[PDB]
Ligand binder design. Structure first.
Ligand SMILES: O=[N+]([O-])c1ccc(O[C@@H]2O[C@H](CO)[C@@H](O[C@@H]3O[C@H](CO)[C@H](O)[C@H](O)[C@H]3O)[C@H](O)[C@H]2O)cc1
Ligand SMILES: OC[C@H]1O[C@@H](O[C@H]2[C@H](O)[C@@H](O)[C@H](O)O[C@@H]2CO)[C@H](O)[C@@H](O)[C@H]1O
Ligand SMILES: *[C@@H]1O[C@H](CO)[C@@H](O)[C@H](O)[C@H]1NC(C)=O
Ligand SMILES: [Co+2]
Ligand SMILES: [Co+2]
Length: 434
């Protein structure tokens, strides 16, 4: 797609800290940009939509190439359309925003310049942020994560994409998402099927795969940390069901691991660690700090800080595994105890380290789940299981929770706030900000 300018594009500024081994931190100035899927897509020479509801224009978009030639992405009114605001080092995303139309959530990338994404090399480093999940009920996911996206949003590889990172192009993740309207500088109208339960979305013939570090997927009830490897590390197109991922026939039939090696303390047995109020170790009614450390072995370490008290990731015992480091032994024990082989089939933490060795883009989002109602995060899943099934219970939410239309109607003012991002060598991000 190209870019149009019927609507100006002004990326909300966002600062973050780059810390160094010598003990100091230096303020960085970036901005956030919304993913292309949320934008108005229209004809280059008029205001006629190329996409509306969950249908492509059959005249403007008879095939993927013609559609991309005929159509452009336009600018975003971040606050008034999308409920996205920033202030200094803080980013807030509202759940439902009513303007001329209804908007649900957002997916945002951290920029280096107004035309390029910020890349981070996670291996050897740590990432810290503060979050307020107090206004996230059952069924919602305020997510902070990394994906192996190109810094230019795909432009250098696909010159029919002239919109680029400035307009939030080039997304990929470990679900090999097929809901994307543009992939690799062409539309995704070929094979498009509207979603049965979402008036605004569908599934096309192409998807976009890459490695994904899910640092944080959470609401006020549950949280999870999940690396997802792929057989090809970086962004790559996939074809149809061959994509695998959540929305293909066989989620396991593609090049990415859609499940991951997940660590949810509640799922692992500690039902008192994270939740709303003073009966939990971490009180999700209050802001908390989350630190994630990528040691060079390929293992992942985690600690939390709230009100000046520090907690390592709680210990878990699972099969022959015991500890609090997300390592090969944990991931292996998890497959043995809970079931499945997706993570190991895609090459495990060894394959994952090939991603964290290179650059990844920071993503912050807020979403509800039109596939599984977020039950995999915060409830019992599958819903016919009981606590006697290892790993079935992931949080205290009812198995009836998280129906998108219901939570959108009941909790439209839900929101997440991410703030105080700090990045640098392991051991550095707790030092004084600059
Ligand atoms: O315990 N404290 O509260 C405490 C201890 C040490 C300390 O040191 C000062 O830290 C600040 C912030 O990290 C340093 O400033 C930064 O230095 C950077 C050096 O590359 C760069 O110039 C940054 O822009 C600047 O903010 C400062 O030099 C330390 O003395 C502060 C508080
Ligand atoms: O449902 C989408 C969700 O799946 C996660 O994976 C689940 C998987 O669905 C389930 O069958 C298994 O028992 O538990 C896995 C871990 O919760 C992914 O972690 C997540 O990315 C979503 O894609
Ligand atoms: C949960 O984790 C906290 C923090 O490590 C610990 O103090 C507490 O004993 C754990 N509780 C259970 C039930 O595992
Ligand atoms: Co094709
Ligand atoms: Co270690």
């Amino acid at each position: 797609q190209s870019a149009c300018t019927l609507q100006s594009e002004t990326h909300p500024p966002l600062t973050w800290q780059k810390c160094s081994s010598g003990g100091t931190c230096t303020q960085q100035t970036g901005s956030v940009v919304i993913d292309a899927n949320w934008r108005w897509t229209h004809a280059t020479n008029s205001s006629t939509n190329c996409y509306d509801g969950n249908t492509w224009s059959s005249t403007l978009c008879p095939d993927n190439e013609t559609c991309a030639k005929n159509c452009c992405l336009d600018g975003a009114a971040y606050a008034s359309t999308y409920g996205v605001t920033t202030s200094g080092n803080s980013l807030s995303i509202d759940f439902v925003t009513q303007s001329a139309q209804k908007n649900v959530g957002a997916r945002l990338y951290l920029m280096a310049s107004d035309t390029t994404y910020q890349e981070f090399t996670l291996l050897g480093n740590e990432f810290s942020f503060d979050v307020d999940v107090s206004q996230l009920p059952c069924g919602l996911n305020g997510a902070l994560y990394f994906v192996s996206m190109d810094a230019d949003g795909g432009v250098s590889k696909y010159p029919t994409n002239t919109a680029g990172a400035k307009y939030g192009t080039g997304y990929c993740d470990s679900q090999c998402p097929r809901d994307l309207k543009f992939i690799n500088g062409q539309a995704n109208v070929e094979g498009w099927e509207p979603s049965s339960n979402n008036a605004n979305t569908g599934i096309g013939g192409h998807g976009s795969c890459c490695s994904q570090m899910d640092i944080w997927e959470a609401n006020s009830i549950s949280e999870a940390l999940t690396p997802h490897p792929c057989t090809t590390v970086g962004q790559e197109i996939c074809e149809g069901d061959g994509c695998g991922g959540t929305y293909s026939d066989n989620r396991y039939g593609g090049t990415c691991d859609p499940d991951g090696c997940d660590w949810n303390p509640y799922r692992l047995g500690n039902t008192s660690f994270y939740g709303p109020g003073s009966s939990f170790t971490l009180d999700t009614t209050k802001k908390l700090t989350v630190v994630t450390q990528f040691e060079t072995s390929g293992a992942i370490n985690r600690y939390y800080v709230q009100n000046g008290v520090t907690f390592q990731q709680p210990n878990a015992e699972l099969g022959s595994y015991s500890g609090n480091e997300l390592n090969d032994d944990y991931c292996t024990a998890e497959e043995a105890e809970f079931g499945g082989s997706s993570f190991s089939d895609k090459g495990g933490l060894t394959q994952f380290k090939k991603a964290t060795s290179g650059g990844m883009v920071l993503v912050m989002s807020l979403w509800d789940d039109y596939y599984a109602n977020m039950l995999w995060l915060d409830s019992t899943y599958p819903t016919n299981e009981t606590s006697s099934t290892p790993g079935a219970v992931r949080g205290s939410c009812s198995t009836s929770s998280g129906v998108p239309a219901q939570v959108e109607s009941q909790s439209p003012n839900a929101k997440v706030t991410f703030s105080n991002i700090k990045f640098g060598p392991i051991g550095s991000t707790g030092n004084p900000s600059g």
